[PDB]
Amino acid sequence: SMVYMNIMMAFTVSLVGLLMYRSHLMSSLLCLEGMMLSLFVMAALTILNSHFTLASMMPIILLVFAACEAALGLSLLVMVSNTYGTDYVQNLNLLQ
């Protein structure tokens, strides 16, 4: 119903201009963990009314990697501030 349009409008918390930009890179890793619960909820609304009885273990497992994923990504974001003190995505040295 309208309970899916909101929330499919709320999947646009990626929006890629604000998925790596601008600086204070913690603001970009924020919406990477906040892009979940637009997948954790959008799955949970579908498994639950339509009684699948078995696929509802999948929303439990959906958090378990994305927590461990983002925790890894947060380890490296200390290493960019361990060498500097500021994350500041307009750091660029290795060109392309």
Binding site: N49, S50, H51, F52, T53, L54, A55, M57, M58
Partner: peptide, 18 residues
Amino acid sequence: RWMTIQSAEQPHKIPSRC
């Protein structure tokens, strides 16, 4: 292979809506 389709096992035999 068991969690794939909507009608496979049903641990205590409660089916779906379709």
